[PDB]
């Protein structure tokens, strides 16, 4: 589990969105595994607007933050899970790192801010849904 809280937005994995998220929906995209809902309170996270390919992510199944090198956002084939069939997921970045299904939502960050959230993994890989192109998260 986990979310990004920037401005009056909450960014979560679409597959973990709650009824309150759907009832306060701003934007969702199944191909990216992302959903954004509105919040009453202002958040403290800031979004990175950069080209970093190194950062640090939070892994709840180890209670640890790990440094990682990750690929550029791309269209990658992801195997079937409890939440989606096997399909291509867009804007996904892969790294070598520990992950388990409930690690989705952990933040990946660089010196500029939040880069994305854990969305996929297995066998010593972890995949992150990028948010750096969603410029509207920084306003209104
Ligand atoms: C945290 O991910 C794992 C880690 C180890 C093993 C398996 C997983 C699960 C995993 O790969 N997915 C990909 C799915 C997607 N974003 O399409 C999502 C619903 C679950
Ligand atoms: Zn950066």
UniProtKB/Swiss-Prot annotation:
| Superkingdom classification of source | Viruses
**Annotated positions binding Zn(2+) 1:** 50, 52, 110, 112
**Which transformation does this protein catalyse, written as a reaction?**
Selective cleavage of Tyr-|-Gly bond in the picornavirus polyprotein
Residues at the catalytic site: 15, 33, 104
Role noted for this protein: Cysteine protease that cleaves viral polyprotein and specific host proteins. It is responsible for the autocatalytic cleavage between the P1 and P2 regions, which is the first cleavage occurring in the polyprotein. Also cleaves the host translation initiation factor EIF4G1, in order to shut down the capped cellular mRNA translation. Inhibits the host nucleus-cytoplasm protein and RNA trafficking by cleaving host members of the nuclear pores. Counteracts stress granule formation probably by antagonizing its assembly or promoting its dissassembly.
Q: How does it assemble?
A: Homodimer.
Q: What is this protein called?
A: Protease 2A
Organism of this sequence:
Coxsackievirus A16 (strain G-10)
């Amino acid at each position: 589990s986990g979310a990004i809280y920037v401005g009056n937005y909450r960014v979560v994995n679409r597959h973990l969105a709650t009824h309150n998220d759907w009832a306060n929906l701003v934007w969702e995209d199944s191909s990216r595994d992302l959903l954004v809902s509105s919040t009453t309170a202002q958040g403290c996270d800031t979004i990175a607007r950069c080209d970093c390919q190194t950062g640090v992510y939070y892994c709840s199944s180890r209670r640890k933050h790990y440094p990682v090198s990750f690929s550029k956002p791309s269209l990658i084939f992801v195997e079937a899970s409890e939440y989606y069939p096997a399909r291509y997921q867009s804007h996904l970045m892969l790294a070598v790192g520990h992950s388990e299904p409930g690690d989705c939502g952990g933040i990946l960050r660089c010196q500029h801010g939040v880069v994305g959230i854990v969305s996929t993994g297995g066998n010593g890989l972890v995949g992150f849904a990028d948010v750096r192109d969603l410029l509207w998260l920084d306003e209104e």
